[PDB]
Write a protein that binds this ligand. Structure first.
Ligand code: HEM
Ligand SMILES: *[C@H]1CC(=O)N(CCCCCCN2C(=O)C[C@H](*)C2=O)C1=O
Ligand code: FES
Ligand SMILES: [Ca+2]
Lengths: 392, 106
């Protein structure tokens, strides 16, 4: 299903890559993308797939492009196919009030208890689908906590978020249902506030006046959904890896102080986001002629897999000296959820390894990866001897 | 290697900071909430604004051009010793460097 080569694209830059179905997906999705970095592949290629678009393959180009918002615009960040900087800055100021480092640090104990409560209900069974049994309910419950939503609302929220990722409902319909759930709560918590995420957003100010209920619900919706797919799937890549590496598990058990650093090396190695930008005008970029309106994929996942940035990039080394990645992005739009995501990962590894130190992939299981804007794991069946576990 | 963060209200945080880490990154890792670091350290946000103590203002490598453009957007008072601390990388020679942190980043 391929698009015709545009006049300005030279044949020697054409590369056969479908980001939704790459050829070597069965070796793992990071491995499938790294074929873009084999020895004679250009730093910037063009694929005929998915409408036709550029792909920058090296961390150097990817960083440069994300820093240059003047030529590379985020008006169309997805393949295949917003608001001004002053509103953008105020948007990020408010999101940082909601999910910034001060909020996360004081939230950590309740995150830790949730992680514990979740794992303890799993531990004595000796098996789980990690993706369905832990990875999915953990971040959605963390959001309820942050937003001060009651525990009995989860199955409804779980349902709505899934439909934005899955059933019997348009994406637009699912978004509106999520909005329609938030608006009554926003209106109740407005002016008569608490310290939860929704109260803070509802009482925020934009351009000197109160945030509208419309602006508030979109911000709320965005903070809920933006933290789901990426966290769900990153935890699964991570736990898949640990299930296959008993030596790496032991290192963290004996030296739990290395878990934050280990978390950063897993973020580099199992990076999973790939979006891009659109050219605002004609531009000569690293010897390559880009035309106005060209889409360019700038895969956040590829910077840290680049051997020019990290020696032996497929190797996981928890003592790796200079960990270089762009897993949360780069430039002005770097993930506003990065501090919450990091704490979620660090708390998960610690509370899981404390209670279930030994586990493997279920015998005969084929772990299937999926590729896209957010790559992921279909299912992760784990098994362990429940007598070898520890309630805490 | 050591770094001192003086808050606007006089509060003092003395911090042990590894070589190679930016002054932004050590701050955000250690509860220094008056440094925000929103863009994550690429000179794209100006929310890591600090004032470098005059004794060290010449020990630190000069701001590059991207940092200078970004500094024009600090929300607190822009001073001759204003720097983005994501662009200041800790080195043994900077041991004891003092930076004063503005009253706002946003
Ligand atoms: C492992 C976890 C995560 C990863 C790897 C990740 C990755 C990313 C990346 C690469 C971007 C930038 C995309 C671009 O520049 O085009 C981004 C943006 C964003 N992320 Fe995250 N993310 C994660 C978790 C979260 C969480 C927990 C939240 C919770 C609120 C969140 C909310 C957002 C939002 C709202 C944006 C838009 C930022 C903007 O446009 O200014 N993400 N994420
Ligand atoms: C959306 C995404 C993006 O990168 N972007 C532009 C960057 C805005 C912030 C930098 C611009 N800037 C200055 O040039 C001075 C002060 C300042 O904030 C979007 O609008
Ligand atoms: S952290 Fe964004 S400019 Fe320093
Ligand atoms: Ca409605």
């Amino acid at each position: 299903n391929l698009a015709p080569l545009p006049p300005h694209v030279p044949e020697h830059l054409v590369f056969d890559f479908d980001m939704y179905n790459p050829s070597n997906l069965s070796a793992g999705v990071q491995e499938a993308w790294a074929v873009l970095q084999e020895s004679n592949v250009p730093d910037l290629v063009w694929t005929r797939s998915n409408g036709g678009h550029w792909i920058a393959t090296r961390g150097q180009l990817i960083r440069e492009a994300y820093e240059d918002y003047r030529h590379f615009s985020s008006e169309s960040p997805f393949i295949p196919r917003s608001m001004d900087p002053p509103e953008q800055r105020q948007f990020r100021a408010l999101a940082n009030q909601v999910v910034g480092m001060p909020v996360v640090d004081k939230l950590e104990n309740r995150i830790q208890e949730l992680a514990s409560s979740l794992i303890e209900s799993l531990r004595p069974q000796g098996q789980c689908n990690f993706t369905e049994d832990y990875a999915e309910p953990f971040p959605i419950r963390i959001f309820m906590l942050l937003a001060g939503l009651p525990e009995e609302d989860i199955p409804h929220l779980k349902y709505l978020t899934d439909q934005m990722t899955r059933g019997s409902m348009t994406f637009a319909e699912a978004k509106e249902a999520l909005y329609d759930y938030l608006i009554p709560i926003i209106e109740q918590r407005r002016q008569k506030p608490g310290t939860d995420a929704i109260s803070i957003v509802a009482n925020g100010q934009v351009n000197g006046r109160p945030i509208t209920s419309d602006e508030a619900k979109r911000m709320c919706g965005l903070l809920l959904v933006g933290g789901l797919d990426t966290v769900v799937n990153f935890l699964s890549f991570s736990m898949e890896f640990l299930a296959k590496s008993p030596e790496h598990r032991q290192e963290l058990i004996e030296r739990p102080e290395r878990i934050p650093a280990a978390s950063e090396e897993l973020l580099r190695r199992f990076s999973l986001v790939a979006d891009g930008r659109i050219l605002t005008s004609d531009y000569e970029f690293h010897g390559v002629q880009l035309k106005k309106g060209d889409q360019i994929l700038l895969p956040q996942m590829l910077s840290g897999l680049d051997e020019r940035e990290n020696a032996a990039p497929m190797h996981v080394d928890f003592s790796r000296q200079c960990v270089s990645h762009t897993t949360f992005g780069h430039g002005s739009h770097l993930c506003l959820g990065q501090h919450l995501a990091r704490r979620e990962i660090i708390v998960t590894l610690k509370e899981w390894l404390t209670r279930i130190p030994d586990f493997s992939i279920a015998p005969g299981a084929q772990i299937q990866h999926k590729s896209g804007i957010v790559s992921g794991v279909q299912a992760l069946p784990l098994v362990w001897d429940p007598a070898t576990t520890k309630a805490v | 290697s050591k770094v001192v963060y003086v808050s606007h209200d006089g509060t003092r945080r003395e911090l042990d900071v590894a070589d190679g880490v930016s002054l932004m990154q050590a701050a955000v890792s250690n509860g220094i909430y008056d440094i925000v670091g929103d863009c994550g350290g690429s000179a794209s946000c100006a929310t890591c604004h600090v004032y470098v103590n005059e004794a060290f203002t010449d020990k630190v490598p000069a701001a590059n051009e991207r940092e200078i453009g970004m500094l024009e957007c600090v929300t607190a008072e822009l001073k001759p010793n204003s720097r983005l601390c994501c662009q200041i990388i800790m080195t043994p020679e900077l041991d004891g460097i003092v930076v004063d942190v503005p009253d706002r980043q946003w």
